[PDB]
Amino acid sequence: NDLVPDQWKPLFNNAQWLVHDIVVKTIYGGLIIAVIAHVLCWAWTPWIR
Amino acid sequence: NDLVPDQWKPLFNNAQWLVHDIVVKTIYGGLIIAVIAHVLCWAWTPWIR
Amino acid sequence: NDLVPDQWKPLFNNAQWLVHDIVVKTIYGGLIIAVIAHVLCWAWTPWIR
Amino acid sequence: NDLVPDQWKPLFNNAQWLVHDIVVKTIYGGLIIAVIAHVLCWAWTPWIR
Amino acid sequence: ALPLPSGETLPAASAEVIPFSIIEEFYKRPGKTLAARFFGVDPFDFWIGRFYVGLFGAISIIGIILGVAFYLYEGVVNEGTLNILAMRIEPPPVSQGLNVDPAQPGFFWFLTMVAATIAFVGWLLRQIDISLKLDMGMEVPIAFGAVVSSWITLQWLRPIAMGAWGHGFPLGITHHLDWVSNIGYQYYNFFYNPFHAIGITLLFASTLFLHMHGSAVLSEAKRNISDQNIHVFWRNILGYSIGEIGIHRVAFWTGAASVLFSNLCIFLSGTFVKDWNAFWGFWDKMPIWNGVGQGALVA
Amino acid sequence: MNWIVATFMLMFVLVAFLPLVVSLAYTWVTNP
Amino acid sequence: SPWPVWSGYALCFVPLAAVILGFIIAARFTDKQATSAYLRLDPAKAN
Amino acid sequence: PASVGGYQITCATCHNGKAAGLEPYPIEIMNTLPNDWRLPLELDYPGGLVVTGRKDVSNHEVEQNQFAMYHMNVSMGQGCTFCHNARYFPSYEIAQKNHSIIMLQMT
Amino acid sequence: PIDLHDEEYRDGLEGTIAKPPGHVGWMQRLLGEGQVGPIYVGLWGVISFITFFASAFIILVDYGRQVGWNPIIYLREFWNLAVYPPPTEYGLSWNVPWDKGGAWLAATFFLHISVLTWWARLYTRAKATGVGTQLAWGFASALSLYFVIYLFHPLALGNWSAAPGHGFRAILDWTNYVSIHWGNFYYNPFHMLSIFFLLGSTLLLAMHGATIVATSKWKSEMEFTEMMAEGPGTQRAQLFWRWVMGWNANSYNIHIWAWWFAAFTAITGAIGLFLSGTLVPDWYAWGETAKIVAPWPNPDWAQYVF
Amino acid sequence: RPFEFRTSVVVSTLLGLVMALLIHFVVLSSGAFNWLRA
Amino acid sequence: RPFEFRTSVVVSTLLGLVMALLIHFVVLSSGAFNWLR
Amino acid sequence: RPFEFRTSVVVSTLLGLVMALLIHFVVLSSGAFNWLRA
Amino acid sequence: RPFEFRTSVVVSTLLGLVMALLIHFVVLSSGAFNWLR
Amino acid sequence: RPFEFRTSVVVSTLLGLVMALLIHFVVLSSGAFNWLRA
Amino acid sequence: RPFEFRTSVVVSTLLGLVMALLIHFVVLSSGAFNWLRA
Amino acid sequence: RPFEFRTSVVVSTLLGLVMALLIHFVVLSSGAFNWLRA
Amino acid sequence: RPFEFRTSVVVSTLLGLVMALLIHFVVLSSGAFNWLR
Amino acid sequence: RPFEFRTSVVVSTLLGLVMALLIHFVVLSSGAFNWLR
Amino acid sequence: RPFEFRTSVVVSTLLGLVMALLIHFVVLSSGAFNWLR
Amino acid sequence: RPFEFRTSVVVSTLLGLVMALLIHFVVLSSGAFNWLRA
Ligand code: BCL
Ligand code: BCL
Ligand code: BCL
Ligand code: BCL
Ligand code: BCL
Ligand code: BCL
Ligand code: BCL
Ligand code: BCL
Ligand code: BCL
Ligand code: HEM
Ligand SMILES: [Fe+3]
């Protein structure tokens, strides 16, 4: 756990930090795309009325 | 893992790097082809209207 | 693995290289025949319209 | 089996005598209540006629 | 390297590499069949190839040959179909009764059914003899006897009890299904027959038990384990392990019980009952709830 | 319906049930 | 029209022949493995 | 046809010895069915209760068909094969199914 | 590298409960073992428990509502109560009243989650005990049939009404209705193959059980030890089945035979059920066109009349 | 002794409970007392 | 002692809960009190 | 200590997810909000 | 002690949740409050 | 530590996939969006 | 000798008895003799 | 010796008896001879 | 040798007998000879 | 490492193939494109 | 080597025989050639 | 290496053959090509 920050050393391993970063970046990209898709769908036709 | 880059050494093997690279190129070609196919299909007949 | 190139030595064996070459050539010929057949069928009867 | 009477020693334990007494008292109370309830219900509506 | 029964080749117990010929020769021990006890001698007490032929082996083979000949004759001749998926081998008409006449149609159905019954009983007795020669138990004969009793119920007891003898099944491929369908819909909701439901439950349980036992035994064949891993695995999931000897007992019992209840339901449906929906009319009239409802919730 | 013959055939069926019951009883009597 | 349809051909007669051949082949190889020579306990000593 | 006989309909056919208070759908015949089921007399019976391979209906229509069919069974005492061959229900071969068509139109 | 004592006697989550084993007695006399023993709970099984009991609670509460909340009538009509899917109109929509199919969808969803988590539990415990994972794939082959019945068949038909109604009597009605709708499954070839495999499975189970019990005087039931070296009981069983029908197997092949019978039963059933409605609307007509239907001009119909 | 106290207690309590429930249900269904809306 | 405290507590609690539920359901379903419409 | 953090977290997460799904299903089926369908 | 803290907590939580869900379902089905249409 | 990274990843991925499939099916089967011929 | 005397005796007696029973049954079933009202 | 004498005798006897039974039954059922009531 | 005399004799005899029975039955079924009524 | 390359490859390939087949069949059965008549 | 000669020969022969029989039967049943009446 | 050559070859061959048969069936069943008597 050389690369793990001091705060999260008891919970994380050096190999797991990289996979965690990849997962977080994927989630943030997916959230942005989902927000855009929801905005376009609402502009197309509202679902609440 | 001599040919593996320094950053990704703890996660990858020497033989796994080549297979991963092949899969990455395959995914990139498939994505380009799928984008083209979707554009032509939309130009032919919209599915949302 | 004497006949295998340097790049693919960890992945391939001297015996598997020849069979891989055979398979690659077979797939190339199959793709050529498939393209010709598809062009002929399109010339005969279009399926998209 | 100090508390168990002489006749009932071969069947009962010292601990089961008290539970048997409790069960007997409960059954006697239940029979008294049942007799009262049956008399009340007969005074309300005869079920033989 | 020592070859294991599974197929492993493990480099090196009191075991040794023994050909099957020695075992086959050692365990012959002629002269202990059922017919030998009765008559003092078995007329056929030898082997023809890998098979053992006894007194009842001859009877079984005669029945098999005669039944196959009669079956082919009724279906190739007298029908002129020439294919086996369109043959329709019928018993005599219900009007004829319990009597048999060679001139009237349906006689070769009688011949085939009698020959098949003889062959089945001969096979059962041959199994008993082979079991008795090896000093084994009589479990396989019990299971097969359950199956043979299932046959006898359908082809002998029900037609005699109903008394017209046209109530037995045609022996045709894809055509006994027609008889099953018509009989099942004549007594409508054959699902609602209790013994049919018990038999279906036992059949499904038998299949599930077979799959579970096969998986459990196959999951430990070629591994370095201590023989107690399977017990811990079966106690961690479902919290119970039956053991080695209990699973086979359960299998045999479930298999026999399914067929027994099935033949019971078929016979009972034939004669003592007419409708399986009317059989349940007693339920709602019992004097614990016959007065508690209103409107559609009455009864 | 002749009810004597039907009851006889039913008795034969219940007899056919017997061998499994005998096997169960034998297994219970042994293994004490 | 003395012949069945193509769907009948496939759905009926391909699985039937497949089942028959598979059963015969599996029985033959099971018997071959069963009758081979491997470790066994000697019947003379074993009781 | 004359095979059935020549029986006629009279007062006792429907009344059966009662002046009034007739009971169509009594409780004893409503055994397996829902207690508020009635015959669907708003349909065209030459094709009213057809379900085989329709592909525009589902299990609910089959359930309604089964209710009607069991009612037809109970009203007689001959079981489901009286008018049908169980190998193929759509078949018209038993000769009491056309009689049932005429009866349905009459009802 | 695997300590069975640890895998059977841990505490907390990822451990076991009911740790002091019970004893039944009569199961020890009749079956040879009567230890109730501890049971594992490891986050694959808590989810199954919660989801299955949520589904059961939904179904039971709907049962109660259908009888006007009368407990006596609840006992009266328990076995003929059901929670049916939405009617044929509004085929695959979820905007349905709770009493017109709303509860069926939720219960079915929770049941799907429960069965998937149970498969995960089986796989994980097989891995953690050191044994193989054949049971997981057998359960997968049965879940294939289950998912064809409940999910994949109602899809591609266009309605939820093609699925069973969650009742004791509703499954029997579903079987009858599906048979009547699509012709006759007696002429469905995959129904025939499934029946062949099912009856073969029952036959094989009976034969194996009887064979092992008959030779149990020589310790033939210890399959794990016999796979190392054959004993007198296995030799007697092989000789018996060789002298009866001319061929036999050893104590290792029969299990492969049984596993493949059960797997083929499940797979062929699933394929036949899926193919029943989408491609062949009438099985009897197909059988007639395939020349597998026997001619039947002049029946004797007096057998079928009262 | 022929029977233990525990088995006797269990059997007696179960029999009493089942009999009480059965009698109450039968009397309710009989409709002969005008109890709980007739 | 013939019975443990644990068993007695469990049986009593289950019996009481079941009886209370049954009595409430019977009273609600009878429709003789004008409660909950 | 009576319970581990793992068991509490798992039970709480599962209960929350199941409750949310059930409430959403019931609200959708009631049809009292004019949402996702007329 | 006859019972442990863990068992009591589990049983109480399950009983409370089950009772609350049952009461909400009965109240919703009764149709006597004008709730959710 | 309480939970492994593997278990969290597996549960999160499976839950996301299941929820995506269910939401797509519910939204598209509602017939309120006019997607692929109404 | 290929066959023993007692084996031949058993086989011959059994075959003769079976054939006699079969011939009486077939003749009776034919109904061509007016025997037992036939 | 390729075959034993007893096997040959037994097989021949079985085949002959089966053939005789089959031929008599076929000829009786064909009704082409006027034997045993036509 | 690959095949024994006994196996060849058995296979040949069984095949011949089965073929003779099949041919006689088919010829009888065809009804093209005016044989046996 | 938490996950091996082989398992990820297998799961990705299976998911992709299943999704491709499902989407093709859904689009074909929708009948909104005039494809294959 | 990855595969042995016997396996290749067996698979090829089985596939060829199956495809040949299937194609002849499909063509015969199609009734588009005027073959065998 | 993550995967052996045999596994790749077997999976590829099976997938190709199954896909070819399925595509031929789906194309020829549609009746939109006029092949082999319509
Ligand atoms: C209304 C008039 C009805 C009728 C209605 C009922 C009903 C209703 C019941 C009986 C019961 C009985 N009836 Mg009456 N019965 C009728 C006519 C008859 C006739 C007759 C010839 O006509 C006879 C012989 C009987 C005879 C009997 C007995 C078998 C029995 C009562 C005695 C008993 O067992 O006490 C022994 C009983 C006990 C020891 C019970 C003790 C219970 C204890 C006291 C606990 C009570 C609950 C309390 C809340 C617990 C609280 C504490 C917590 C547990 C911590 N009935 C008519 C038709 N009868 C009762 C019975 O017990 O049936 C099994 C019963 O429930
Ligand atoms: C309204 C009039 C109704 C009727 C409605 C009801 C209802 C409704 C109930 C009873 C109950 C009972 N009825 Mg009444 N009952 C009627 C007529 C009768 C007649 C008769 C001859 O007419 C009789 C003999 C009885 C007899 C009885 C008893 C068996 C019982 C009450 C005593 C008891 O068990 O106390 C002992 C009870 C206790 C010790 C309860 C203690 C509960 C503790 C305090 C917990 C309470 C809940 C609280 C929220 C907990 C919170 C904290 C959390 C635990 C963390 N009823 C009529 C028809 N009756 C009740 C019962 O319990 O039946 C089994 C019951 O539910
Ligand atoms: C529309 C009006 C409806 C209604 C619709 C709903 C719906 C729909 C829901 C509720 C929910 C709840 N309702 Mg409301 N509700 C109504 C009326 C009521 C009434 C009342 C007496 O009138 C009451 C008391 C309540 C009470 C409640 C609570 C029990 C609960 C909200 C608090 C909570 O638990 O937060 C605790 C909740 C959380 C801590 C959630 C945290 C979630 C985290 C942030 C993740 C979110 C997902 C996100 C995509 C994750 C992204 C990253 C990836 C994981 C990588 N409702 C009316 C009838 N109500 C909700 C519920 O049950 O929640 C469990 C719910 O879903
Ligand atoms: C019918 C008229 C009213 C109505 C009338 C009432 C009334 C009256 C009441 C409620 C109450 C409640 N109502 Mg309501 N309610 C209505 C409509 C709603 C709607 C809706 C969708 O419309 C919702 C979501 C709710 C929701 C709720 C809850 C917030 C609450 C009950 C909580 C509960 O389950 O406690 C039971 C829960 C438990 C026993 C579990 C607790 C678990 C804790 C919180 C978490 C940790 C668990 C721990 C880790 C476990 C450890 C052990 C494990 C074994 C490991 N109401 C309508 C509008 N509602 C009740 C209330 O106020 O409660 C406070 C109440 O009395
Ligand atoms: C059209 C408008 C519809 C509707 C249609 C949908 C549909 C359809 C979906 C959602 C989804 C979601 N909806 Mg919406 N939704 C509506 C109204 C709402 C409302 C509301 C009004 O209150 C809310 C609160 C939400 C909330 C939500 C979220 C839970 C979620 C989107 C964010 C998210 O989780 O991102 C977190 C998501 C991610 C991190 C995913 C990232 C995935 C990455 C990008 C890979 C994707 C797969 C791709 C094929 C990969 C290709 C390469 C290969 C891997 C090699 N919806 C209305 C009714 N909504 C989506 C969802 O995810 O549901 C679970 C979804 O599928
Ligand atoms: C009625 C005219 C019928 C007909 C009716 C029958 C009948 C009936 C039978 C034959 C049989 C045969 N038929 Mg012719 N047959 C017909 C037309 C033909 C035609 C033809 C081209 O038309 C041919 C080629 C044949 C050919 C044959 C032979 C296969 C065979 C007779 C020879 C034989 O086996 O000798 C070799 C025979 C033996 C060596 C037998 C020896 C038996 C010993 C002597 C014992 C006799 C029994 C005695 C009771 C024993 C007592 C023992 C006690 C201890 C005392 N049939 C027409 C259609 N045929 C017979 C046969 O054997 O079929 C298998 C037979 O049963
Ligand atoms: C009537 C004209 C019918 C017809 C009716 C039959 C019938 C009926 C039969 C044949 C049989 C055969 N047919 Mg032709 N057949 C026809 C047209 C043809 C045509 C053609 C293209 O037209 C061909 C190629 C053939 C060809 C053949 C042969 C395959 C075969 C005869 C030779 C053989 O194999 O002997 C090999 C056989 C032997 C060497 C047997 C020797 C048996 C010994 C002599 C013992 C006999 C039994 C003995 C008496 C029993 C008692 C023993 C005791 C110890 C006493 N047939 C027409 C349509 N054909 C026969 C056959 O055997 O088929 C397998 C047969 O049964
Ligand atoms: C519907 C309109 C057209 C039509 C349109 C097309 C089009 C368009 C195409 C075809 C293609 C093909 N068509 Mg078409 N086709 C028509 C009518 C027909 C008819 C017919 C009787 O009418 C036939 C028989 C065929 C036949 C064929 C094949 C020759 C070919 C696909 C082969 C294949 O499976 O590749 C897949 C096979 C494999 C992946 C397996 C290969 C195995 C090798 C050969 C052997 C390996 C052995 C070794 C031991 C194995 C080792 C591994 C083992 C696991 C141990 N077509 C109609 C008239 N057809 C395709 C083509 O041309 O392909 C080149 C194509 O694209
Ligand atoms: C009538 C016109 C029909 C049609 C009828 C048939 C029939 C019928 C057959 C084919 C066959 C084939 N068809 Mg074409 N076919 C049609 C249209 C097509 C179209 C198209 C796009 O239109 C295509 C691409 C094809 C393609 C193909 C090939 C896949 C194949 C031939 C090559 C091959 O594999 O040889 C490889 C084959 C061999 C090497 C066989 C060698 C056999 C040896 C010589 C032995 C023969 C048997 C002999 C008796 C042995 C005797 C001695 C003993 C061994 C001791 N067909 C049309 C619709 N086609 C044949 C095939 O093989 O299908 C699987 C086949 O049977
Ligand atoms: C017995 C319970 C029973 C069953 C089952 C049954 C089935 C059935 C079906 C499936 C149909 C329709 C199938 C189709 O595609 O047409 C159908 C139709 C009719 N039946 Fe029926 N039937 C059962 C019982 C009976 C009985 C006892 C009779 C005669 C009184 C009878 C008759 C009819 C008639 C008439 C029809 C035609 C319905 C119509 O055309 O609308 N059925 N049955
Ligand atoms: Fe075993």
Numbering used by the authors:
A (entry chain E), B (entry chain G), C (entry chain I), D (entry chain 6): 7 to 55
E (entry chain L): 7 to 18, 29 to 315
F (entry chain Y): 1 to 32
G (entry chain Z): 12 to 58
H (entry chain C): 161 to 267
I (entry chain M): 335 to 640
J (entry chain 5), L (entry chain A), N (entry chain D), O (entry chain T), P (entry chain R), T (entry chain H): 4 to 41
K (entry chain 7), M (entry chain 9), Q (entry chain P), R (entry chain F), S (entry chain J): 4 to 40
Sentences from the paper on this structure:
Roseiflexus (R.) castenholzii is a chlorosome-less filamentous anoxygenic photosynthetic bacterium. It contains only one LH, which forms an unusual RC-LH complex. The 15 LHαβ heterodimers formed an opened elliptical ring surrounding the RC, which contained L, M, and cyt c subunits; the long and short axes were 112 Å and 103 Å, respectively, and a tetraheme binding domain of cyt c protruded into the periplasmic space. Each LHαβ non-covalently bound two B880s and one B800 BChl on the periplasmic and cytoplasmic sides.
